[PDB]
Amino acid sequence: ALVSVPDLASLPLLALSAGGVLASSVDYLSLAWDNDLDNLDDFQTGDFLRATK
Amino acid sequence: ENALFPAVKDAIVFDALWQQAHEKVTALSGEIWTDTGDHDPGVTLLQSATWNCSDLSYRASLSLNDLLTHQDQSTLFPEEFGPEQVLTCNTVTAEDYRRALLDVHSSFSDVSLTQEPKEHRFHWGNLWLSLVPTRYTQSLSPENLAAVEQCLAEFLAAHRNLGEVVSRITWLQPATFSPRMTIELADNINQVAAQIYQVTDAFLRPAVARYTTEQRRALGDADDAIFEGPRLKHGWQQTAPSQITSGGYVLNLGPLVNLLLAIPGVASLSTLSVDKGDGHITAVTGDNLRWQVADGYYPLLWGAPPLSLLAGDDSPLTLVRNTLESEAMAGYLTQADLIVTTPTVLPAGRFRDQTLYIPIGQRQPECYALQQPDTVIDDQTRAVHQFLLPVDQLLADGTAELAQLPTLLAFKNRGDAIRGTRWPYTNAMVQQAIHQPYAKTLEAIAQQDAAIFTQDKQPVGGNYARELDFLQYLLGYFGTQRAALPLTLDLPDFLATQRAYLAQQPALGYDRINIRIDQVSALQKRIAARIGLDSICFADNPDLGQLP
Amino acid sequence: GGNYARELDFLQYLLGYFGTQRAALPLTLDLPDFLATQRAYLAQQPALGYDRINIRI
Amino acid sequence: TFLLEPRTGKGLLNLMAKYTEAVPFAGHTDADWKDFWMAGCTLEALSDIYQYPGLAEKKLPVQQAFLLALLHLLETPRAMLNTVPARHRSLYYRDLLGFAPRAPQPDSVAVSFTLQRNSSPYALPAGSLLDGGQDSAGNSITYQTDDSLLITGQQLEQLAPELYLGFSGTSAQDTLSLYWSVRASSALDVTWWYYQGTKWQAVLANAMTATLNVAQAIDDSHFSQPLPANTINQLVTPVAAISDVRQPLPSVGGQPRETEMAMLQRAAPRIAHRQRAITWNNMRSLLMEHYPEIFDVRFPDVDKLSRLPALEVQSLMVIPDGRALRPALSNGRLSRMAQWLSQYTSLWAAPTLKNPKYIDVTARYRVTFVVPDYGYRQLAAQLQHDYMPWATDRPGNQVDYYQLLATLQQSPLVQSVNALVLSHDTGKPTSMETQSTVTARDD
Amino acid sequence: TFVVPDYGYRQLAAQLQHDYMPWATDRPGNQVDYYQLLATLQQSPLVQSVNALVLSHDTGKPTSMETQSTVTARDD
């Protein structure tokens, strides 16, 4: 997917925007594990998150 | 990644947590808080706190190599708490001076250490020593020999147990016992003579095997067997002659399936006829078995390999035919030397840690709050700020304790608290200036209720007890035990005694043996930490302690 | 460079066809005349069977 | 075990009750916010509802239900966080220091192979696939023959020609193969005085025509149980010589894969002592590490250690277990024990080991019973069992008086004790121990 | 000398007798070397250390023996 993050974002919204690129319901806890997030709010308004399946 | 995340992934993902909270409030209340849709405000507050709790749980999974990294230290543990510095190895007190000394050829064989033989006392017991230098007895030591002697002297200074330092060193002179044999071969030169020189030289001194630790654990043993004796900077010994005696010893080879079987190994040569072309070292009666008695001074071979290449050779190699030998065997075809060095163990840290916290009030949608501080809100929109303050700090204490577990489970440098406590807000965040004129007051409440209070201690707050519980649990790693509670000492110096007793565990293994003059003889500080004193007994610089 | 050795390996392997064996390495001859000796010993195998008997002049 | 985070929702609620008093009930004045969370109940009554939710009868103020739901949620990351220090310890023992729970050992049995009625002496090769039951998991364990042998018909007349023994297979080239099952000994020497080309400590048992076996390693769910005479035949049957094959005896040694708790228990003394016998209890621990027969090891007395003739013999008492009552182990092995431990000592140490001395102590009861004579015998056997634990279990050197009182009248058949005068060589309210003896209690 | 009494002499005798008359079982030399028999003996796994291997034909140790009309053999 390679989803960009917007300003004022959140991982349930970043999973809906990654679940529309893949159409596979990408279940936000797997996003923070695949990208090595620290605390579920780690992205900083302009960095990318990679979503596979 | 020992990380818990595929193990707890079906317990931290906010639907399990929300149904656990929702059934909880359905059980506690239930005819007072009847509507639970997403339109009641308290439902939204509780589920936002649930999201922050799930954040806090997700932080508390990954990973054990990542939770424990401090911020800046390269390794999780100090490298002195690694193996071969902890009490797996030792400093030498057995015969192992031998294996303490058979590694210093990098800047020789057969150390013999013993005691004085029931006489030669000082008449009001010490040790004697015995070395053969073989490859230090060279042309490269008419003056370097004295430097090697004083390095041996400071070695013996470095290894001196509780009493009775050694008294005699006994440099041991050669005998140049060089035999003569003839061999015979079939096909293909100057390499077989070099190997015959190597086998006949290595037959004199007994055995020296130096393995890398991964070379040895591939042979099929464990680290409690590998990390046994000295700190070997080179290899790992296992040999136990002691070829040196006191009656000279018969030195003897050479049977059909024994000592003469290490001569036909060279992959060119047939059978032999061996002679002893010298008269200084005697031969016992019986030459078809051929033992050759030495008398307390060690044998060498021919000396130089050009002394193996006279007009009178000592190993003619017939083919049918002169079979001459040049100096090709001496410079090359003869080198079999490697060197081993150990960095003694390193693990690696990561530090994916944090100081970030998001309060509940900015999880909430933009119709309640996030309004600027104490200017626009009207003393009831501040009431929900105070409603969310204990919940925010209870959610923040998990973050605070989480970011102190590498120094709560610390050996050397330990902190001055029991758990973590952090003020959950930041400058350029609205909820600090709203809580401002009591902000210093209440964070002082939660800080003193988590520290151990360095001066006259917490009397009924068992933080002083809980720190000793930490010390008990960590000292239980090293086979030790926390010193008992003094009913008659001061508290803080006893606590500093106990934490310094924890902080030097691998150092406190060595100084039972080998008292160096430049410390407090840490057997003494072992005793001085078994009962709590720590006047000077740690941080070893000053004098005036409790004297033995 | 064991090319001189490898040619003698060829000679050993080919002389092993005819029930013979390459002559051993002289430690005291020249090399090229020995190599020409060995290859000519290979090159006359069927001729070298007859002249045990019937010496022609 | 050790916890790494105490203070549950009771402790959190105590901290929160201390904490919320600092906040004014804003908009209102002279009102603590601690009033808001603690309206209706006290701290302890609210914690009781926290443990048992039914104490609220589906009603309480909803900020308290909110708070208890919060704390029940907060229990979970505390539970993950309490799983840290055990993982820390195992990370330090396994990743660093390379400790590991060591692998198990294979079994060994001896099977007998009696012949047919009359066929021939028949030869078995090594590894003949003897059968030994099924499993604990469900696939057939087999043992293999260690060495090839022949089966001739050698039986065993009592302990006709041998030195101390006899058979019934006396022929030429008898090629007899025995199995012995003997205890530990001191390695005696026998001559076996007969000749074969011309015809004519205690043991457990013997066998004839026997060969030892091993566990053929393919898989496992055992090595915790030795095989109890479980072998009756073998894989594919030779009719040449089987009327039977029996093992008579259990397997020699399994020594199963140790637990992680046992691995930690192996690891912590090995960093207590450096695999060295330097001071006292290096010797005790190192010597109980290697010889399981040793029940305890005691030490010489403190002032005896503090005398000006430094003793230079390093004597230490070893009490065995008999493997009966008041055991004393043979001097033929104690010198070997000292010689074994001496290579892990320092120089100038030379420690020596002693069987203890046994001072039995008597005392009379004069005791009333509940509900006649039988109680004296049962109380005697009970009181004798728990004061010599080297008989069965795994004590003190001294015997206390009033502790023996409170040992006696708590017994369920004992009504009331009257006089417990002790006797050693005589007075009641006393004790007894010396650091050269081991006390014991008769009657 | 032996490792670990008399039995080793018999086993060594049978072993050393087997490999020197290979026409008994297998498919040798006409001569017998001394030091090769040394290195044949002390490599045996029950042999600790050999002391004196004086040969006897008809008498001296460090020798050999063969003629081109006979076949040698080794008893003991």
* Count, residues in chain E: 76
Chain-chain contact of D91 with B8 (C-beta, under 8 angstroms): no
Please name the residue that has the structure tokens 């909880």.
B24
Pairing of the two strands D438-442 and D358-363: parallel
State whether D65 and B45 contact (CB < 8 Å). Answer: no
Angle A13-A16-A22 from CA coordinates, rounded to 5°: 145
Residue D114 vs residues C15, D14, D153, D170: alpha-carbon distances, Å: 61, 79, 7, 16
The per-residue DSSP string of B246-287 comes to SS----B---TTTGGGGSTTSTTB---EEE---SSS---S-T
Q: Give the span between the Cα atoms of B404 and D5, in whole angstroms.
A: 12
Chains near C (3 or more Cβ pairs under 8 Å): B
First to last CA, chain A: 9
Task: Give the resolution to one decimal, in Å.
Answer: 3.1
Q: Which of E35, E40, E55, E64 to mutate to test the interface with B (most CBs of B within 10 A)?
A: E35
**CB within 8 Å: C27 and B187:** no
Q: Tokens 């923040």: give the residue.
A: B396
CA distance E42 to E32: 17
CA D363 to chain centre: 33
Identity of the residue in A33, A38, A41 whose CB atom sits nearest the CB atom of B352:
A38
SS3 B171: strand
Phi–psi pair at B457, nearest 5 degrees:
-75, 175
In angstroms and rounded to an integer, the radius of gyration of the C-alpha atoms of chain D is 34
Chain C neighbors of B187, CB-CB under 8 A: 24-25
Backbone angles phi, psi at B483, to 5 degrees: -60, 145
Secondary structure of residue D32 in the 3-state scheme: strand
Apex D329 CA angle, D327 and D335, nearest 5: 155
Residue listed under structure tokens 């009494």: E5
Assign D276 to helix, strand or coil.
coil
Nearest CB neighbour to E37, from listed B256, B286, B291: B256
CB pairs under 8 A between B and E: 81
**Which of A10, A13, A35, A40 to probe by mutation at the B interface, max B CB count within 10 Å?**
A40
Q: Which two tokens stand for residue B295?
A: 């008398």
CA-closest candidate to residue B189, choices B307, B302, B328: B328
Provide the phi-psi class of B360: left if phi over 0, else alpha when psi is between -120 and 50, else beta.
Answer: alpha
Q: Which amino acid is at D318?
A: V
Neighbouring CB atoms inside 10 A of B396's CB total 21
Residue D212: DSSP 8-state: E
Count CB-CB contacts under 10 A for residue B209: 10
CA atoms within 13 A on the CB side of D179: 25
CB contact under 8 A, A38 and B353: yes
- This entry's atomic model was obtained through cryo-EM
Backbone angles phi, psi at D374, to 5 degrees: -55, -35
Q: How far is CA E70 from CA D271, E17, E18, E65, E66, in A?
A: 71, 18, 19, 10, 7
CA B215 to CA B354: how far, in whole Å?
41
Crossing angle for the helix pair D282-290 and D260-272, nearest 10 degrees? 140
3-state class (DSSP) for residue D320: strand
Q: How many CA atoms lie within 13 A of D161 on its CB side?
A: 12
Q: Find which of C22, C27, C28 to mutate to test the B interface (most B CBs within 10 Å of its CB).
A: C27
Q: What is the distance of C-alpha D238 from the center of its chain?
A: 43
Q: Are E30 and E64 in contact (CB under 8 A)?
A: no
As a whole number of angstroms, the distance between CA E9 and CA D373 comes to 71
Residues forming a β-bridge with B109 = B132
Tracing tokens 């969370």 back to the chain, one arrives at D37
DSSP SS3 for D315:
strand
Q: Which residue on chain B is closest to C25 by alpha carbon?
A: B187
| Cβ–Cβ gap C25/B323 under 8 Å | no
Q: Cis check for the bond before B242: say yes or no (omega within 30 of 0).
A: yes
Q: Which residue has the tokens 């002389």?
A: C15
| Cα–Cα distance for residue pair B476/B481, rounded to 1 Å | 6
Residue C5 contacts B, CB cutoff 8 Å:
no
Is residue D187 within 8 A of residue D330, CB to CB? The reply is: no
- CA–CA separation, C26 and D373 (whole Å): 108
Which residues partner with A48 through β-bridges?
A4
Residue D282 sits at φ, ψ, to 5 deg, of: -70, -40
Distance CA B464, CA B490 (A): 12
Transcribe A1-53 into DSSP letters: --EEP-SS--HHHHHHHHTTTSSS---THHHHHHTT-SSS----SS-EE----
Question: Which tokens hold the place of D122?
Answer: 């028949």
Token pair for B161: 């147990």
Q: At B183, which helix (H) or strand (E)?
A: strand B180-184
Which helix (H) or strand (E) segment is B318 a member of? Answer: strand B317-318
